[PDB]
Every structure is written in C-alpha cells, then in structure tokens.
Amino acid sequence: SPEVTMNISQMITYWGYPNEEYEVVTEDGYILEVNRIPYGKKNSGQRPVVFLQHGLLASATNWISNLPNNSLAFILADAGYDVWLGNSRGNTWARRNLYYSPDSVEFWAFSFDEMAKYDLPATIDFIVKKTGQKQLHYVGHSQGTTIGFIAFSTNPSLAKRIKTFYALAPVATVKYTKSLINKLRFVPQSLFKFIFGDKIFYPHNFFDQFLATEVCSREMLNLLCSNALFIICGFDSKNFNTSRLDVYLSHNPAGTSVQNMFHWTQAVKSGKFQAYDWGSPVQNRMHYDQSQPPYYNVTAMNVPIAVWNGGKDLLADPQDVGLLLPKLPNLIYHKEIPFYNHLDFIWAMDAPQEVYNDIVSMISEDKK
Amino acid sequence: SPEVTMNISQMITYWGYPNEEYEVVTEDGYILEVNRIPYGKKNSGQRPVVFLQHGLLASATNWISNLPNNSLAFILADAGYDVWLGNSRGNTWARRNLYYSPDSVEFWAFSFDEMAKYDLPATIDFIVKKTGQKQLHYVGHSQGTTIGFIAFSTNPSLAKRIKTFYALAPVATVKYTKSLINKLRFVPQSLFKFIFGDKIFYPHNFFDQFLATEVCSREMLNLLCSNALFIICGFDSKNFNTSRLDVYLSHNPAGTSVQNMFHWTQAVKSGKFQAYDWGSPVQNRMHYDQSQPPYYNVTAMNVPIAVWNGGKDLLADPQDVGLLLPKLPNLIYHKEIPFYNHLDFIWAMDAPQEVYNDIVSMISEDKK
Ligand SMILES: *[C@@H]1O[C@H](CO)[C@@H](O[C@@H]2O[C@H](CO)[C@@H](O)[C@H](O)[C@H]2NC(C)=O)[C@H](O)[C@H]1NC(C)=O
Ligand SMILES: *[C@@H]1O[C@H](CO)[C@@H](O[C@@H]2O[C@H](CO)[C@@H](O)[C@H](O)[C@H]2NC(C)=O)[C@H](O)[C@H]1NC(C)=O
Ligand SMILES: *[C@@H]1O[C@H](CO)[C@@H](O)[C@H](O)[C@H]1NC(C)=O
Ligand SMILES: *[C@@H]1O[C@H](CO)[C@@H](O)[C@H](O)[C@H]1NC(C)=O
Ligand SMILES: *[C@@H]1O[C@H](CO)[C@@H](O)[C@H](O)[C@H]1NC(C)=O
Ligand SMILES: *[C@@H]1O[C@H](CO)[C@@H](O)[C@H](O)[C@H]1NC(C)=O
Ligand SMILES: *[C@@H]1O[C@H](CO)[C@@H](O)[C@H](O)[C@H]1NC(C)=O
Ligand SMILES: *[C@@H]1O[C@H](CO)[C@@H](O)[C@H](O)[C@H]1NC(C)=O
C-alpha cells in the first residue's frame, strides 16, 4: 500500500481531504506539529472543533490510518466538524525543543504527566484562539484518556473548554491487566536503564522470552510480535483489515520515551493512579513541591464523559475499567463491546457501527 | 397480585392509562384484536405512532406487564406517543377467522411467515388509516424482530412506513443457540405431530428429560420450568421482579402454533433463515410457487435499525447475532448488554436504564 511510506499529511491528502499543519510550543519549550482536517473531502465540504488524542505507544495517524469510511477523523470531517489530531512530545514531528536536542537525555525526560500538564493546554489554547471557538469536543484513546483525566481534573480553565469527553479504552489504573506490560514490574530502574536506556523506547529482546510472544510468532508476522504497540496492547488482529497491517507497523509507535514506559511500570507495580516517581524525595520536590508523587483524583474530573471499553482488552482490562466508572462524577454513557480489544477501537473494521457512529450522534446534540 | 387474572385491557386501565381495542382482519381471514394506549396516564395526557411486537412464545402483554415506570409501552405513552400493541394469529384475542374455527387444524396451519406476510401489513394499514400518520416507529422483541426482517425486506410499501426499526434480541438465524429448542432437532415431523399434534403448542413432557430442566426444578418454581416461554427462552429470572412471576406465567405464552415451533426447529436444523417447508415440492409450490422454501435476504431490509442483544441470551445467542449485524445495510446503532438474557429485554428491572430510555431518545429525534 502506498500509504506505508507516507507521512501524516500525505496520508490525509491522499484521500482528498484538506490538511493543515500548525506549530504549537509548550510552556516548557517543546515544539509540536499538529495536523488539522478543516472539512470533509466533499461531505460537508465556524464549524465545531473535535480534538483526537492517540494512546500508548501509538500515533496521531491512528485516526487516519484506514479508509475514509472507517477512520474516525475522516468520518468526523465528512459529518461537518473541524478535526484536530493531537501530537505528543517525542513522537514524530514533535521531536524538537527550544533548549535541548532530541539526541539528549533531557529531551526524553518525560511521561504522560508532562503531556497533560504542557502539551494539551498549549495545543488547545492554540486551537481555541485560531478557531475562535470557546469550547470543543475531546476524544481520547488509551493513554489519550488518561492524559485527559489528569488535565481535566487539575486544570479548571482547560476543563471548562471541553463540553464532552469521549473515552475509548480508558486507563486510570493498570493493576489488573493481562498485558505483557506486567513483565516490567519484574524490573528495577537500575535494570530498566541498562535494558532500554533513557530516550526512545524500543522493546529490545525483553519480551521474546514470554509465552504470549511465542504464540504470536506462531500465528502472525514477526514484524507484528516485535512491535511495542502490539506487544503492550495486544497482538490480536482478527477485526483488522489485515491488508493494512503494514501501514500500522510503519507508523507505530510514533515516539515513546523510556521514562514514560517506566512511569507505567510504576503504575503496574502500585496499582494506583499517580504522578511519576522521579527517584527520590529531593527529585520529587523539584517537580511536585512534595516528596511523594501526588495522586490523581479521577473523581475531580467533572467533564461529562462517555466511555467505550473492550471485553477482550488486555491493557484497559474490564476489571480496572470496572473500578473506574463508579468514581466518575458525571458519567453520561457507557458501553462495553465484548469482542473488542485495546486496538480494535481504532482499527476494527466495524468500529464505525460499534463506536464512531455513536460519537457522531452524541456530538451532534451538544455543540452542533 | 390482582393482575394475574386481568386481561390485556384491564391490566392497562389498572394503572390509569387509556385503552382502546380494534379489530384487524388479515387478507387471509384472521381476526386480530389489537390494543392501543393513545396517551400517558397524566404524563403527555396527532401524536407519533410506535408499534410493539412481542416475541416467540410470548404475549402482547409483555410491554405492559410491570410497573408504569419500567414497562416500555407505559413509559412510551407518558413520553407523548401513541402506543399500539400488535397481536399475532393464534394468541389470545386473535383466535378467530372468517373461514374456519380455532378448533380446526387449518386455523393453526401457520408460522411467522404468515405473521409477516398478513398480520403485520393488515394491522399497520389499519393503524396508518386510523391515525392518519404516514409513518411509524417499529419495536420488535425476539421473534418480533424476525417478523420485521421478513416483512420489511419483502414488502417495500410497508417498509416505507417504518422510519426506525428497534430490534431487541434479534433473531434471523438460530444455528448456535444454547436453548433447549435444540433438542427438537432430534425430532422428525412424524414424531413431532405424535408428540405435540397440530394446533396449539404445549411442552408436554418432551423437555423433562433434560439437564437444564432438572437444574431449573432444583432452583425455581415447577410452574416456571414447565412453561414453554421459559423452557425455550431461558429460566433465568435474576433481573426480574420475582414478585411478578405469577403475572408472567398467567399470561405467556399467549398462543403459539405447533407448526410455528416446527418452522423454528427446521431453522435450528439448517442454520439458515428461510420460509417454512410445507413438506414436499408440491406443497411448497402451492405456497411459494417454487418447490423449495425461499430464503430471507436480511441484507434487503433497509429500514434504519438499532439493535440491543444480550450476552447471556441462550436463544438470540451472540454468535448468531454476530453473523447478522454485518449483513444489515443501514445499521444505525448496536449495544450488547453482557448480563442480559432473552427475556431480560422485557422484564429486567433495569430495562429502562439499559434499553428503553435510549429508545425514547432515539425516537424523539426522528418523528417527534
Ligand atoms: C482493506 O484494505 C485494502 C487495501 O487498502 C482495501 O482495498 C483497496 O482499497 C483502495 C481504496 O478504495 C483501492 O484503491 C485499492 O484498489 C483496493 N485494493 C487493494 C488491493 O488495495 C480494502 O477496501 C480495505 N477494506 C476492506 C473491507 O477490504
Ligand atoms: C415488584 O412487584 C411488586 C408487586 O407488583 C411491587 O410492589 C407493589 O407495587 C404496587 C405499586 O407500586 C403497590 O400497589 C403494591 O402495594 C406493592 N406491593 C405489593 C405486595 O403489591 C414492587 O414495587 C415491584 N418492583 C420492585 C422493584 O419492587
Ligand atoms: C510530508 O511530506 C511532504 C513532502 O515531502 C512535506 O512537505 C510535509 O511537510 C511532510 N509532512 C510533515 C508533517 O512534515
Ligand atoms: C468501507 O468500504 C469497504 C470497501 O470499499 C467496505 O468493504 C466496508 O464495508 C466499508 N466500511 C464501512 C463502515 O462502510
Ligand atoms: C477528590 O475529589 C473529590 C471531589 O472533588 C473530593 O471530595 C475529594 O476530597 C478529593 N480528594 C481526594 C484525595 O480524594
Ligand atoms: C377484559 O374484560 C372486560 C370485562 O370482562 C371486557 O369488557 C374486555 O373486553 C376484556 N378485554 C379483552 C381484550 O377481551
Ligand atoms: C420504579 O418504581 C419502583 C417503586 O415503585 C422502584 O423501586 C424502581 O426502582 C423504579 N424503577 C425505575 C426504573 O424507576
Ligand atoms: C439480497 O439483497 C441484496 C441487496 O438488495 C442483493 O444485492 C442480492 O442480489 C439479493 N439476493 C440474494 C439471493 O442474496
């Protein structure tokens, strides 16, 4: 497929949709190139803003990786909205900073904490100011939702701008997962850095020794089994248009830091939902003004939220989701797709019938 | 409770709702008494029409059998609609025909084929003409949905009148069911008639010999275990208001024919979705002008449809529903309630929060 070697822009214009790139600069210096799809490729050729956040080890191209009839972003554009695809520090086209290079350790010294605290506010302020729209619709997947949880429950002025928070495969805690991500709990920082170093996160061979990895190798392409996106989010591609795997592989992950994965293993080990542990009381103070990483109050997140979770989701496992839902003040909708796993929400051929359609509707009764 | 001995009308007026009875006469001579609830009991005391079809071995009273706050028909009336409860040939108050008696064999020589071809068109024509409304909203449960599938995919003029088809526990095929209805596959016509005869269908003892029946007897009332509705659709009454069981038992089944059950066992045996096999090429010609029962093209059913299916539904099993959904051109919504079985859709205490409320909303955005 021709899109295997196309960047986000080319992939979008390839299907005849409009594309715009903007540069957002975070408070702490990161420069993020965000893409915008201002209107449909004819369908609905001022308009309400809808922001899409990809998840863990993913890419902003997730929302654009298939046919225009089954990719959230394209269908949302044809439905009459102004689609903005969020880009996080570290991933492709977001690897620059005013004060340090991508080749430095300092550049990658971040986790989702920073994404919520800096990347989101900056990107949205930009979008509001550029569009003049006072509010927008937020759609997050996987880690994208957890960014929202943190942001929206600690940034009132930001939260006020979101009229509805659509969460696909939510993740606040990760204490009951069936994901290979658990194997990392067996690893201390000392070892973590010796295995993966600082900077960009690559699986290396850490996972070959695991059963699930031998089973994968047996069934699907080696290419798939040695890709961190799948290793941590599931190898199952039953509901995928297997003709486009090479496209997902060539675009994910877009750029994840070793620190971020370590923050998640910290969560796998504690089962809580809290900020990153910088290593010591002194270091945590220099970041949180406390000696202990603060916890994230999911019940202080009031934005009206709709949740869609999978029954076969190994990362955002039903059990964890189970503990989450009740804590959500103002949960306006919930649906559990039994045969759906973590990545089905983005790449499943029936994702429009199972999820997307519902969102389009739900949105066209608030802002539009 | 007092409703145990009340007819459909009395049950309705018992809660302070208006009631009207109308006589519909099918093309082939059957006389059906249909009930109408023209408005709420105070709530919304001209209005859009919503037709409700009960399912296999059920009763039109299903939509009225509980409290006014959890019975689809009542809530629909209070929501401002004109509710019509369909009655099928054979069941209570639909056991008369211009040319033969209920005591004859000919009277019961029917299956859902006839319900779709004759009962539905006639009842709806009448409703249209009476209310002046050119369109209506159709809500089917169990076999009620299958009637719709046939009707709406073969009767264009009829289909045009349905703006939205709400399907609860859909059933086009029945080849992967966990229902005792499978045991019938072990039976040939010769034996079927010797065991159940023609005319009305009674369980007789055919099912006592089965495990699920011993387990039921062990847990619930014998009354329940020897009632065809539950034997074929599930004995589980966890989500029910168990204080009203005696009401369900005294009203179901309203009247099912042995021929209808044989049509369903034919389906269990073939795994397909097709018309009734009258027994021989000659007999089939005299009914379909072919020698083989025609098949029902579910993909020819264009009415916008919304589907709600249960995770623990033994009859409308997830697997079968699984094969159906993809075939539906124009499926506008889908939700699978994991803990719901076949009859939960009508009698579950949280049916309003799980299904009804979304239907009311969904409707109040089309016609009303
Ligand atoms: C699954 O992926 C394939 C490959 O992208 C899709 O088929 C192609 O669709 C594009 C766009 O219409 C055409 O230009 C190509 O000619 C098609 N064939 C091939 C071999 O690429 C297919 O439509 C996708 N979806 C499904 C359900 O098959
Ligand atoms: C379950 O059914 C019982 C009986 O139908 C309900 O309780 C009755 O409710 C009606 C009206 O609400 C009263 O007139 C009766 O006095 C109540 N008790 C009895 C013994 O009849 C009960 O509310 C229903 N639902 C639930 C959840 O309890
Ligand atoms: C994609 O490639 C084109 C052509 O080489 C380039 O102009 C565009 O800027 C690229 N997209 C991004 C996000 O850099
Ligand atoms: C999108 O198009 C492909 C073929 O072009 C089709 O097979 C698929 O069902 C379509 N998906 C949707 C959601 O319409
Ligand atoms: C969390 O948020 C709720 C609601 O604002 C509040 O009652 C509670 O005290 C907060 N703090 C903690 C630690 O839970
Ligand atoms: C219910 O009973 C009443 C009084 O016995 C009767 O008038 C009414 O017609 C009955 N309802 C039906 C549907 O027959
Ligand atoms: C209906 O009313 C009864 C009390 O009569 C209550 O216990 C039940 O929970 C209510 N259900 C709904 C959906 O309102
Ligand atoms: C079934 O319906 C579809 C859509 O109307 C049609 O294309 C197909 O030829 C029909 N016939 C059969 C036998 O499937």
Method underlying the structure: X-ray
Query: Residue A29, Cα to own-chain centre: how many angstroms?
Result: 21
Residues of A within 8 A of B365 (CB-CB) are 365
DSSP 8-class letter at A243: G
What order of strands is seen across the sheet that includes strand B162-168?
A: B20-25, B31-37, B82-85, B49-53, B136-141, B162-168, B305-310, B331-337
Q: Name the β-bridge partners of B257.
A: B200
Judged by its nearest atom, the ligand closest to the C-alpha of residue A243 is 1
Q: Nearest CA of chain B to the CA of A335: how many Å?
A: 7
How far apart CA A198 and CA A194 sit, in angstroms, is 9
Q: Closest to A354 (Cβ–Cβ): which among B334, B338, B365?
A: B334
E strands present in A15-111? 20-25, 30-37, 49-53, 82-85, 96-97
Residues 6+ apart with CB under 8 A from B191: none
Instruction: Assess whether B101 carries a catalytic annotation.
Output: no
For the purposes of burial, counting CB atoms within 10 Å of the CB of A112, is it exposed (0-12), middle (13-18) or buried (19 or more)? buried
SS3 A233: helix
How far apart CA A233 and CA A235 sit, in angstroms, is 7
Q: Tell me, what amino acid is at B286? A: M
Contact status, residue B325 vs residue B334, Cβ threshold 8 Å: yes
Q: Closest to A357 (Cβ–Cβ): which among B311, B332, B365?
A: B332
Q: Is A243 in the pocket of ligand 1 (CB under 6 A)?
A: yes
Residue B288 to residues A21, A232, B202, B280, B284, Cα–Cα distance (Å)? 62, 56, 29, 12, 6
Q: Is B1 in the pocket of ligand 2 (CB under 6 A)?
A: yes
Q: Tell me, what amino acid is at A355? A: V
Contact status, residue A73 vs residue A357, Cβ threshold 8 Å: no
CATH no. for A1-368 = 3.40.50.1820
Contact status, residue B100 vs residue B106, Cβ threshold 8 Å: yes
Resolution (A): 3.0
Nearest to B120 by CA among B167, B51, B55: B51
Q: Is B243 in the pocket of ligand 2 (CB under 6 A)?
A: yes
Please report, for chain A, the start and end positions of each structural domain, with discontinuous segments joined by +: 1-368
Task: Please name the residue of chain A whose CA is at the shortest distance from the CA of residue B328.
Answer: A353
Judged by its nearest atom, the ligand closest to the C-alpha of residue B241 is 2
Contact state of A338 with B335 under an 8 Å Cβ cutoff: no
Contact status, residue A331 vs residue A359, Cβ threshold 8 Å: no
**Backbone phi, psi, residue A162, to 5°:** -95, 120
Residue with tokens 């955002």: A316
Q: Please give the span between the terminal C-alpha atoms of chain B, in angstroms, as a whole number.
A: 36
Residues of A within 8 A of B311 (CB-CB) are 338
Q: Is B15 in the pocket of ligand 2 (CB under 6 A)?
A: no
Element spanning A334, H or E = strand A331-337
Nearest to A354 by CA among A312, A324, A319: A312
Q: Please give the span between the terminal C-alpha atoms of chain A, in angstroms, as a whole number.
A: 36
How far apart CA A187 and CA B66 sit, in angstroms, is 57
**Biggest CA-to-CA distance, chain A:** 56
How far apart CA A199 and CA B257 sit, in angstroms, is 72
B interface toward A at CB cutoff 8 Å? 311, 318, 322, 325-326, 331-336, 338, 365
Q: Tell me, what amino acid is at B200? A: I
Bond preceding residue A281 cis, omega within 30 of 0: no
Residue with tokens 């080749």: A103
Nearest to A234 by CA among A177, A186, A184: A177
Angle at B67 between CA B3 and CA B123, to 5 degrees: 75
How far apart CA A151 and CA A140 sit, in angstroms, is 12
Contact status, residue A213 vs residue A224, Cβ threshold 8 Å: no
Most B CBs within 10 A among A309, A332, A333, A354, hence the mutation to make, goes to A354
Secondary structure of A84-141 in HEC code, one letter for each residue? EECCCCCCCCCCEECCCCCCCCHHHCCCHHHHHHHHHHHHHHHHHHHHCCCCEEEEEE
Torsion of CA A65, A68, A71, A72, to 10 degrees: 140
Q: Is A270 in the pocket of ligand 1 (CB under 6 A)?
A: no
Catalytic residue selected from B78, B113, B236, B313:
B313
Judged by its nearest atom, the ligand closest to the C-alpha of residue B36 is 6
Rg of chain A over all Cα atoms, to the nearest angstrom:
19
How far apart CA A31 and CA A90 sit, in angstroms, is 10
